[PDB]
Amino acid sequence: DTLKVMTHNVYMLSTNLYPNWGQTERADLIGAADYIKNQDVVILNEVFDNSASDRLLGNLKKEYPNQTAVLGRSSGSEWDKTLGNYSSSTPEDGGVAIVSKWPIAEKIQYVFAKGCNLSNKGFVYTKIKKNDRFVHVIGTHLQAESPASVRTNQLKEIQDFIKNKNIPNNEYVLIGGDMNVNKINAENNNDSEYASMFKTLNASVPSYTGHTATWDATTNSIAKYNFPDSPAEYLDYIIASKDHANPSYIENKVLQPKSPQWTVTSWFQKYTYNDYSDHYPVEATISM
Ligand SMILES: [Mg+2]
Ligand SMILES: [Mg+2]
């Protein structure tokens, strides 16, 4: 069998702080997009805006009916457990959610202890039954660019959680999302943060295919507006724990899907874009 998992930072900032980023329309464009189809599990990042995020989740309901709540937005029975530094008084939620075409046996949220109370950043854990197999998928979004030291602490909390969970070593355990750890020009430096990421989580390095960056101001219309001169970076991953079932093959493919044109007005000026987010999605293929 093959497991298909995708992760995508969808840039859905709160409309209370950023009213004109086309969040609602992109909720519809992403929901109907072909690139996000045919997956087993999908991890979402930055689904911060409550209305637009729920709209997106609703549009994905037909194909991915099994869904978790958004990390850090609530702490009721919608979560089997709410772990970590969760606060109901944080201005924003963690923006992470997971949807699947398969039954979800357990849903857990965990809020990171440290961070440079702004957003309940952390991770979402899911135990999913796919064809009589239980697979484990953790979705997260780490500290954005001292920042590296914070990310290492967060990665540590993720690894510590996995070990404590007592997951069978013959079942697949994947960790994915916007790690904010750059692979560009770092794949050949055992001392880079990119290298440390794999050590801290004790995960294997996947085969890389597709586009060469996940946040590219040189090809992405949204990133180009916000950071015109910033060199492209590679920050999104989906990797497997070596302390559990090691995939004979695991790929991470960066896609460059373009959306139908959409327009927004900001300060009496109209702007048109053809991207779903400032980040590109990463499609993982895992041989089981
Ligand atoms: Mg972002
Ligand atoms: Mg929110």
Side-chain angles (χ1 to χ4, degrees), residues 14 47-50 53 70 73 91-95:
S14 169
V47 280
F48 294 122
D49 189 71
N50 296 4
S53 64
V70 175
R73 188 172 296 171
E92 183 55 78
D93 57 61

Side-chain angles (χ1 to χ4, degrees), residues 9 11 13 46 141 178 278-279:
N9 177 311
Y11 193 60
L13 301 175
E46 297 206 24
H141 181 186
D178 179 353
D278 65 321
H279 274 254

Side-chain angles (χ1 to χ4, degrees), residues 5-237:
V5 183
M6 173 174 287
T7 185
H8 196 188
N9 177 311
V10 297
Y11 193 60
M12 297 222 162
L13 301 175
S14 169
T15 49
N16 282 158
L17 295 184
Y18 299 98
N20 301 294
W21 254 127
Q23 294 95 316
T24 291
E25 179 165 3
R26 283 185 292 117
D28 286 351
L29 293 179
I30 293 168
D34 287 337
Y35 86 79
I36 199 166
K37 300 179 183 294
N38 302 307
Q39 306 299 312
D40 288 303
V41 186
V42 185
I43 297 167
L44 299 175
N45 287 171
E46 297 206 24
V47 280
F48 294 122
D49 189 71
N50 296 4
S51 294
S53 64
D54 283 351
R55 183 163 182 152
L56 172 58
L57 292 171
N59 297 331
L60 296 174
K61 180 187 176 185
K62 184 62 180 177
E63 180 165 17
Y64 306 107
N66 308 287
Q67 311 181 163
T68 70
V70 175
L71 164 73
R73 188 172 296 171
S74 53
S75 58
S77 63
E78 65 281 352
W79 290 108
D80 298 331
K81 287 191 177 65
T82 287
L83 309 176
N85 196 204
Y86 177 83
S87 174
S88 63
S89 68
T90 61
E92 183 55 78
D93 57 61
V96 180
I98 291 178
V99 303
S100 178
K101 60 176 285 190
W102 305 93
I104 298 180
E106 181 164 42
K107 308 175 177 180
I108 293 171
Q109 72 172 333
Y110 187 114
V111 179
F112 292 140
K114 301 174 176 57
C116 298
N117 192 60
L118 289 60
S119 298
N120 279 313
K121 272 196 167 177
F123 65 85
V124 174
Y125 165 81
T126 54
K127 180 184 183 177
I128 304 174
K129 191 63 170 296
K130 180 214 182 312
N131 299 319
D132 189 45
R133 180 190 314 274
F134 283 118
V135 296
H136 309 261
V137 181
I138 295 178
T140 190
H141 181 186
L142 315 186
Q143 171 68 56
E145 191 58 21
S146 197
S149 57
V150 174
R151 288 187 284 273
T152 285
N153 193 304
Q154 303 181 326
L155 289 168
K156 259 202 57 181
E157 295 202 88
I158 295 174
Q159 195 283 150
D160 289 346
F161 168 80
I162 296 174
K163 173 179 180 174
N164 214 320
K165 202 61 171 66
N166 189 205
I167 298 178
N169 66 183
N170 74 318
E171 301 185 338
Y172 294 95
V173 181
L174 310 173
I175 306 87
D178 179 353
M179 304 298 175
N180 271 310
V181 175
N182 200 356
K183 185 175 71 69
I184 292 179
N185 297 320
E187 276 212 68
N188 295 316
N189 185 300
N190 201 57
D191 284 297
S192 63
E193 173 172 35
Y194 167 74
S196 291
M197 171 166 79
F198 292 102
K199 297 178 181 181
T200 300
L201 293 172
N202 210 303
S204 52
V205 178
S207 292
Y208 301 110
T209 61
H211 189 47
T212 47
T214 66
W215 186 68
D216 198 337
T218 74
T219 62
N220 187 290
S221 59
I222 296 172
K224 178 170 181 174
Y225 176 76
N226 297 158
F227 300 76
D229 311 70
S230 294
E233 315 186 327
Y234 195 103
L235 316 163
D236 299 84
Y237 314 76

Side-chain angles (χ1 to χ4, degrees), residues 6 8 33-36 219-220 254-260 274-277 279-282:
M6 173 174 287
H8 196 188
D34 287 337
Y35 86 79
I36 199 166
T219 62
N220 187 290
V254 180
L255 301 172
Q256 294 190 76
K258 293 300 174 176
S259 75
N274 66 329
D275 279 288
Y276 297 99
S277 165
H279 274 254
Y280 285 147
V282 175

